[PDB]
Design an enzyme around this catalytic site. Structure first.
Site, PDB file in Angstrom:
ATOM      1  N   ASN A 119       0.793   0.811 -19.051  1.00  0.00           N
ATOM      2  CA  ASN A 119       1.350   2.154 -18.796  1.00  0.00           C
ATOM      3  C   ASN A 119       0.332   3.175 -18.261  1.00  0.00           C
ATOM      4  O   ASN A 119      -0.844   2.844 -18.042  1.00  0.00           O
ATOM      5  CB  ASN A 119       2.211   2.683 -19.965  1.00  0.00           C
ATOM      6  CG  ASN A 119       1.403   3.304 -21.111  1.00  0.00           C
ATOM      7  OD1 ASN A 119       0.174   3.340 -21.104  1.00  0.00           O
ATOM      8  ND2 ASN A 119       2.130   3.797 -22.121  1.00  0.00           N
ATOM      9  N   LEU A 130      -5.770  -0.352 -20.307  1.00  0.00           N
ATOM     10  CA  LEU A 130      -6.860   0.444 -19.744  1.00  0.00           C
ATOM     11  C   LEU A 130      -6.384   1.866 -19.536  1.00  0.00           C
ATOM     12  O   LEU A 130      -5.302   2.081 -18.998  1.00  0.00           O
ATOM     13  CB  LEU A 130      -7.365  -0.153 -18.421  1.00  0.00           C
ATOM     14  CG  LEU A 130      -8.021  -1.542 -18.511  1.00  0.00           C
ATOM     15  CD1 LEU A 130      -8.305  -2.084 -17.111  1.00  0.00           C
ATOM     16  CD2 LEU A 130      -9.301  -1.531 -19.361  1.00  0.00           C
ATOM     17  N   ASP A 155      -3.867  -1.377 -13.424  1.00  0.00           N
ATOM     18  CA  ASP A 155      -4.116  -0.696 -14.695  1.00  0.00           C
ATOM     19  C   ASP A 155      -5.542  -0.156 -14.745  1.00  0.00           C
ATOM     20  O   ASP A 155      -6.484  -0.828 -14.308  1.00  0.00           O
ATOM     21  CB  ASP A 155      -3.912  -1.650 -15.859  1.00  0.00           C
ATOM     22  CG  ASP A 155      -3.567  -0.923 -17.156  1.00  0.00           C
ATOM     23  OD1 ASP A 155      -3.221   0.291 -17.098  1.00  0.00           O
ATOM     24  OD2 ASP A 155      -3.633  -1.556 -18.232  1.00  0.00           O
ATOM     25  N   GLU A 185      10.428   7.607  -8.114  1.00  0.00           N
ATOM     26  CA  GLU A 185       9.005   7.456  -7.821  1.00  0.00           C
ATOM     27  C   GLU A 185       8.252   6.809  -8.994  1.00  0.00           C
ATOM     28  O   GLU A 185       7.508   5.836  -8.812  1.00  0.00           O
ATOM     29  CB  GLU A 185       8.353   8.801  -7.455  1.00  0.00           C
ATOM     30  CG  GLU A 185       8.937   9.469  -6.211  1.00  0.00           C
ATOM     31  CD  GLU A 185       9.124   8.491  -5.054  1.00  0.00           C
ATOM     32  OE1 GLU A 185       8.205   7.685  -4.792  1.00  0.00           O
ATOM     33  OE2 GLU A 185      10.186   8.532  -4.411  1.00  0.00           O
ATOM     34  N   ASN A 192       5.707  -2.046 -10.539  1.00  0.00           N
ATOM     35  CA  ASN A 192       4.462  -2.633 -10.034  1.00  0.00           C
ATOM     36  C   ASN A 192       3.472  -3.005 -11.137  1.00  0.00           C
ATOM     37  O   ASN A 192       2.789  -4.039 -11.042  1.00  0.00           O
ATOM     38  CB  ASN A 192       3.815  -1.736  -8.988  1.00  0.00           C
ATOM     39  CG  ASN A 192       4.400  -1.969  -7.622  1.00  0.00           C
ATOM     40  OD1 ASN A 192       4.217  -3.047  -7.047  1.00  0.00           O
ATOM     41  ND2 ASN A 192       5.156  -0.991  -7.114  1.00  0.00           N
ATOM     42  N   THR A 195       5.255  -6.106 -13.193  1.00  0.00           N
ATOM     43  CA  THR A 195       5.344  -7.339 -12.394  1.00  0.00           C
ATOM     44  C   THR A 195       3.961  -7.943 -12.123  1.00  0.00           C
ATOM     45  O   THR A 195       3.060  -7.252 -11.606  1.00  0.00           O
ATOM     46  CB  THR A 195       6.104  -7.115 -11.067  1.00  0.00           C
ATOM     47  OG1 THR A 195       7.385  -6.523 -11.349  1.00  0.00           O
ATOM     48  CG2 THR A 195       6.327  -8.471 -10.363  1.00  0.00           C
ATOM     49  N   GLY A 197       1.785  -8.665 -14.239  1.00  0.00           N
ATOM     50  CA  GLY A 197       0.837  -8.175 -15.260  1.00  0.00           C
ATOM     51  C   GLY A 197       0.113  -6.923 -14.797  1.00  0.00           C
ATOM     52  O   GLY A 197      -0.028  -6.676 -13.588  1.00  0.00           O
ATOM     53  N   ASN A 200      -2.466  -6.715 -11.767  1.00  0.00           N
ATOM     54  CA  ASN A 200      -2.108  -7.110 -10.398  1.00  0.00           C
ATOM     55  C   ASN A 200      -1.034  -6.210  -9.802  1.00  0.00           C
ATOM     56  O   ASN A 200       0.125  -6.260 -10.218  1.00  0.00           O
ATOM     57  CB  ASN A 200      -1.666  -8.582 -10.359  1.00  0.00           C
ATOM     58  CG  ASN A 200      -1.632  -9.136  -8.932  1.00  0.00           C
ATOM     59  OD1 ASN A 200      -1.824  -8.405  -7.966  1.00  0.00           O
ATOM     60  ND2 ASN A 200      -1.409 -10.436  -8.806  1.00  0.00           N
ATOM     61  N   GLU A 214      12.542  -1.107  -4.600  1.00  0.00           N
ATOM     62  CA  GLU A 214      13.381   0.054  -4.286  1.00  0.00           C
ATOM     63  C   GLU A 214      14.630   0.081  -5.165  1.00  0.00           C
ATOM     64  O   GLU A 214      14.991   1.143  -5.698  1.00  0.00           O
ATOM     65  CB  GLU A 214      13.747   0.063  -2.787  1.00  0.00           C
ATOM     66  CG  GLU A 214      12.548   0.209  -1.861  1.00  0.00           C
ATOM     67  CD  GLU A 214      11.670   1.415  -2.217  1.00  0.00           C
ATOM     68  OE1 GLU A 214      12.206   2.429  -2.753  1.00  0.00           O
ATOM     69  OE2 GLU A 214      10.447   1.359  -1.968  1.00  0.00           O
TER      70      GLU A 214
HETATM   71 CA    CA Z   1       1.339  -5.573 -11.987  1.00  0.00          CA
HETATM   72 CA    CA Z   2      -3.075   2.240 -18.419  1.00  0.00          CA
HETATM   73 ZN    ZN Z   3      11.069   3.869  -3.457  1.00  0.00          ZN
END
Ligand code: CA
Ligand code: CA
Ligand code: ZN
Ligand SMILES: *[C@@H]1O[C@H](CO)[C@@H](O[C@@H]2O[C@H](CO)[C@@H](O[C@@H]3O[C@H](CO)[C@@H](O)[C@H](O)[C@@H]3O)[C@H](O)[C@H]2NC(C)=O)[C@H](O)[C@H]1NC(C)=O
Lengths: 389, 207
Positions: A119, A130, A155, A185, A192, A195, A197, A200, A214
């Protein structure tokens, strides 16, 4: 602390009035409140989850950019949709952006997007993952108009949201006040990070994968804005207020009517751009949402009730399964794989009590049991596997 | 900058779902150990590293990510993700590991590949990036570099030598060139040998 804002769940200024909300942080998700990072207390739109400011130059600086300060922690600033120029309510804009992003941090935390799950928080409070990666929240960013964007490095590096003024109306409309856009957003950060981990961020960059990127973003905005009185037959558009555009910004409204919205898996064969592909995915997810709500009801409260870790209602269950599926699926997944990951999420969470509801929704829009991925020749399917229903 | 849609990575990972995981299986324990043993069974010739981001979800399922290596470099688009059930058995998994012939380490030992500054220039020119590159490179803490003297980026661009699985399934030796230009934040995979061809571009910025 007081925040004068359009409350969570009000998508845009046309759907409610502003209210004064006291200490709106979640005690678990925001241990230090929204206005501390554990070490420093702030009297501004800055804290553990985000740092919000104007950015009229559109440049990359943010730390020392403008943000309103209030010693009494009374963040009540004037706003009306008829004000011009947008800069005349920059205070209200920064605060609305900060509020919406922080509520979302807290909701996502409750649904499992914690420190160890990658997060966005400056101080992880020893909880794993992190830190140093709150979301940079730029209000009325001068780098563009009629859009918004979100950067998701791995992260440990801040997310970066740039919100724009829209110029398709008189006066201009400030995206900070469309909760749906802010949620869209921020959801790019969620999807991201989860997905492939936390380490990545390359994992929703393929065409069909970024398309789902999207779709997840539109879907979460849509699920959140659900309200008392909504039904399966209710349709939702995207960015309709900000864009001043009938039907919003996507090809069709999100709808359980195939006549209102005819999109199916094979529609993707004719699409070359992630937003259009996203609309297909978010349409499938909208069908899942309503099947789950029909079975389990809908909780209109802003936070779920959890029973042995499982949301008690179909709305928050849908959100939870979608998040859990993101954490299961491979890096750069296709629709079929992401679907399987959602089904496997339900197996892991509930012992598979929603397989019929989920399968039927996907099959309705051509992502049934026989569906096959291909770059240009996807095979659709309306099949639901034997004995799940 | 050019239309980056043409340079998107491929989506050719496999996901072995929970049902198929049981089917394909051979007919307390640490989840990292269980996941590692599983990768070794599926991909017995692969060398790899366990990524330092594994965790147990609030659903009780643990997630472990692996990055394949070759000749001491990452294969940057070769990943394995293992989901371990609360019962301590593998629940489901995905992977994009490379299973072909691994190239000789000769080119690495001999340092027979492009200068990272050449990679930066090739990236800037091909993608038509709004940045100026009369730059120099400096070593960091493994075939990883930072560029100095570049204008137009939010921070100093970087380069890291990696392997990359091309769209034809074969391994390229490539520089991964990172350029944050605010509007876009790019990882560009540009060949370090043959012809300076760009194999893929990742953008951290989404609309
Ligand atoms: Ca990721
Ligand atoms: Ca973090
Ligand atoms: Zn978008
Ligand atoms: C997880 O992966 C499994 C295995 O790929 C999926 O189950 C399989 O689904 C296919 C498509 O329905 C089945 O094949 C089809 O069914 C019969 C063949 O028995 C035939 O009518 C069709 O021509 C076609 O071959 C396959 O039998 C089935 N296998 C099992 C064990 O169920 C599964 O749907 C995936 N998704 C999830 C969430 O489990």
């Amino acid at each position: 602390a007081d925040y004068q804002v359009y409350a969570w769940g009000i998508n845009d200024p046309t759907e409610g009035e502003r209210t004064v909300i006291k200490d709106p942080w979640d005690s678990v998700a925001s241990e230090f409140t929204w206005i501390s990072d554990g070490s420093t207390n702030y009297t501004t739109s800055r804290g553990n989850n985000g740092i919000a400011q104007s950015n009229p130059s559109g440049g990359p600086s943010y730390l020392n950019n403008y943000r309103p300060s209030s010693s009494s922690l009374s963040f009540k600033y004037p706003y009306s949709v008829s004000s011009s120029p947008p800069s005349s309510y920059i205070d209200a804009s920064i605060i609305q952006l900060f509020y919406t992003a922080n509520i979302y941090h807290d909701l996502l935390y409750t649904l499992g997007f914690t420190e160890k799950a990658g997060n966005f928080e400056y101080n992880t409070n020893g909880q794993g993952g992190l830190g140093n990666d709150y979301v940079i929240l730029n209000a009325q960013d001068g780098s563009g108009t009629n859009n918004a964007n979100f950067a998701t490095p791995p992260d440990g590096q801040p997310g970066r949201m740039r919100m724009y003024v829209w110029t398709e109306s008189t006066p201009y409309r400030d995206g900070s006040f469309e909760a749906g856009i802010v949620i869209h957003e921020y959801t790019h950060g969620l999807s991201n990070r989860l997905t492939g981990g936390p380490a990545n961020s390359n994992c929703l960059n393929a065409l069909e994968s970024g398309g789902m990127g999207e779709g997840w973003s539109d879907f979460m905005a849509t699920a959140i804005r659900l309200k008392p009185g909504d039904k399966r037959s209710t349709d939702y558009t995207m960015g309709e207020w900000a864009s001043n555009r009938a039907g919003g910004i996507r090809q069709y409204p999100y709808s359980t009517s195939l006549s209102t919205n005819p999109l199916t898996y094979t529609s993707v064969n004719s699409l070359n751009a992630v937003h259009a592909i996203g609309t297909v995915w978010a349409s499938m997810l909208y069908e899942v949402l309503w099947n789950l709500i029909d079975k389990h009801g809908k909780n209109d409260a802003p936070k779920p009730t959890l029973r042995d870790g499982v949301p008690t209602d179909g709305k928050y269950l849908a959100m939870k399964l979608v998040m859990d599926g993101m954490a299961l699926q491979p890096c750069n997944p296709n629709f079929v794989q992401a679907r399987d990951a959602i089904l496997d999420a339900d197996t892991a969470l509930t012992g598979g009590e929603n397989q019929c509801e989920i399968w039927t929704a996907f099959a309705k829009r051509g992502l049934g049991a026989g569906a096959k991925y291909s770059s240009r020749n996807r095979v659709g399917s309306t099949e639901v596997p034997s004995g799940v229903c | 900058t050019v239309d980056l849609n043409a340079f998107r990575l491929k989506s050719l990972a496999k996901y072995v779902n929970a049902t198929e995981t049981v089917i394909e299986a051979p007919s307390p324990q640490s989840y990292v150990e269980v996941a590692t043993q599983h990768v070794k069974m599926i991909a017995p010739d692969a060398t790899f590293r366990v990524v330092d981001d594994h965790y147990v979800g609030d659903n009780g399922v643990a997630h472990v990510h692996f990055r394949q290596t070759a000749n001491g470099l990452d294969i940057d688009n070769a990943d394995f993700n293992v989901n371990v059930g609360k019962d301590g058995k593998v629940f489901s998994y995905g992977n994009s590991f490379y299973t072909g012939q691994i190239p000789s380490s000769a080119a690495l030992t001999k340092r027979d590949f492009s200068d990272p500054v050449t990679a930066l220039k090739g990236t800037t020119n091909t993608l038509q990036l709004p940045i100026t590159v009369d730059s120099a490179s400096s070593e960091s803490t493994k075939e990883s570099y930072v560029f100095k003297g570049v204008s137009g980026t939010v921070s100093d661009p970087k380069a890291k030598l990696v392997y990359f699985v091309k769209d034809d399934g074969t391994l390229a030796l490539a520089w991964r060139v990172e350029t944050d230009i605010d509007s876009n934040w790019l990882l560009t995979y540009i060949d370090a040998k043959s012809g300076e061809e760009i194999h893929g571009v990742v953008d951290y910025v989404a609309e």
